[PDB]
Nucleic acid binder design. Structure first.
Lengths: 250, 248, 246
DNA sequence: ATACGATGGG
DNA sequence: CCCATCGTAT
């Protein structure tokens, strides 16, 4: 018995690994019928990323037994750089032994590449992210959000996000002076705030600017905040699932 | 208060890109006629002079003349947080030692506000009189930038020789000797010459000057014996940027 | 004097990009038939052979044969001062040690003139005589460049295996094993008399693929116990061949 | 941290 | 064929 998943849009998988490799190097892929789930904290335990790819998003998905694949994300991103952006990527793992096979098929079907990747024995054991609801939920174009985080990183190392019914404000402050970006509430080009209470948290731009490498996956990003609680930045992945990143304040 | 609104914020970004490599600190001389800036490079080899007329701005209010001392490095960094289509507004209030930059998104949902510490600085030069020059070459700026880049791969100095018909640029080094000869033709070369001239300049400086290239599709070289070269970039309905380089 | 005018100067810029990484010094063999150049890499693993026929030039005059010794690094730097649409003219006078390059702008206002110091260097890489090979693979050059780049991320050597239907490229290292299998098919063409399996160093193949801009195809010719020939044809002038020993 | 060249995309 | 972005090299 074996795991095998075929993905006609191989570029999603290349984008997902770009969005993770800077933050994590090693992660356990939790493969099952429901699909692929991945959850890891950054080397420093400051942030946690959680990937969901549903079975239905794949063109073909067979999972005979659940597996816990430990994968070096650096290696896998390297192996994915040998996939053309228009290739059909297929992942295959046989329930015994320790190797993931990647197969990149050329649309023409004259070139077929076949990589075998050494898995890791990494003993993940990771917590439960429950459903939860937050004081302010900002929804905004991801490129705007990326740009905001890049700009303010030129002023300071920390950004102070302040949210109110009408608008969210991002601020940084350093040797050059102070910056202050104030978004107001407005195929995905407008800002939307759903807020129950107001909130003002401060985060490190270094981490937010890792999160924004997910930007190619999604035209929108969702920020959820509540006091003394990690920020959730979420990128929906087409009709497959999501990528969330949690960052603790201060 | 001083306040100037500029709908084409990308000019101001470009102006600061063209200066920051050459100067780090400069006193903006703000008045009703407009903004003037004039300053030598760190080594006093070259002098740059910026003119932005009041009428080039979309709004310009100058209650009292000021001398704003601004760190160009800091201001360029702050301008990198402006989108190329943003409306930039500069605002400085009598008394305060802080320049406000405000970048407004065309959509008008995102508005950025930066506040920049000013420096205490005085309007560091007067000079650069009106004169008429022996040879005035007018040429596509990208051609001129390319010429200065190419010859910098041969030598450290370029010898510019001008005659009625044409100007010639030459350099010489370890690899050999290069020689670009332009003939008289914002896509063509034009020479207005009263006398001929042959001056030698350092390419290191000319290659700073060419960072102004984005401001203008043409550049004007004015030359006369024993006198600094003027390289001028006219700015889209606002004014100019001139750089003076002494021969050698 | 020697004098050759080339309306498509970008070929000569490309030819020097394709050689400078592999060789730094080479003797240009100028003659009536045209320009020939032949030289081994610094470590004598590989030999490159350039052919530019007299008929490919827009003008070609060679009064007597010369052996111009040229620093390819210097000449590439000088060629970087040529616009991609310029007319390049090479001129050498029999008893001078200087090559003149002249770049004319299509407009003909901008004319650049460079003079380049020649070197006094011998000439013999012994070349390779023409032969017929067991497997000849013909394929898009950018595919071949990509293949060589990809597998260089897995291993340092590639094992090229050819059969009537298809060729396979394989590499193997710390990350694991890769394996690209092309089938005969813009398109891949195999002419094979016998099957062939040789192993080459990717370090070298990846220098060879700097010729890629010269040609939309590349030809690999192989036979046992004999160097691989990778050939790039040059637009109506000739070719660039690189031989790598297994 | 900054400035230039080379590359890929439009 | 030009530009902008990345990567490098100072």
């Amino acid at each position: 018995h074996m795991f095998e998943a075929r993905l006609v849009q191989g570029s999603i998988l290349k984008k997902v690994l770009e969005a993770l490799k800077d933050l994590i190097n090693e992660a356990c892929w939790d493969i099952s019928s429901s699909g692929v789930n991945l959850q890891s904290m950054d080397s420093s335990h400051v942030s946690l990323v959680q990937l969901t790819l549903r079975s239905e998003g794949f063109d073909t998905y067979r999972c005979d037994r659940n597996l816990a694949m430990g994968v070096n994300l650096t290696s896998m991103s390297k192996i994915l750089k040998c996939a053309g952006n228009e290739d059909i990527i297929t992942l295959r793992a046989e329930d015994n032994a320790d190797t993931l096979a990647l197969v990149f098929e050329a649309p023409n079907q004259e070139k077929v590449s076949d990589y075998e990747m050494k898995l890791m024995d990494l003993d993940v054991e990771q917590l439960g992210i429950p459903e939860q609801e937050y004081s302010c939920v900002v929804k905004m174009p991801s490129g705007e959000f990326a740009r905001i985080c890049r700009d303010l990183s030129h002023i300071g190392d920390a950004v102070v996000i302040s949210c109110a019914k009408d608008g969210v404000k991002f601020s940084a402050s350093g040797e050059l002076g102070n910056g202050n970006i104030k978004l107001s509430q407005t195929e995905e080009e407008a800002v939307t705030i759903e807020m129950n209470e107001p909130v003002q948290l401060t985060f490190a731009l270094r981490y937010l600017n890792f999160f924004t490498k997910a930007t190619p996956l999604s035209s929108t990003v969702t920020l959820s905040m509540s006091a003394d609680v990690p920020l959730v930045v979420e990128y929906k992945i087409a009709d497959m699932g999501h990528l969330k990143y949690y960052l603790a304040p201060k």
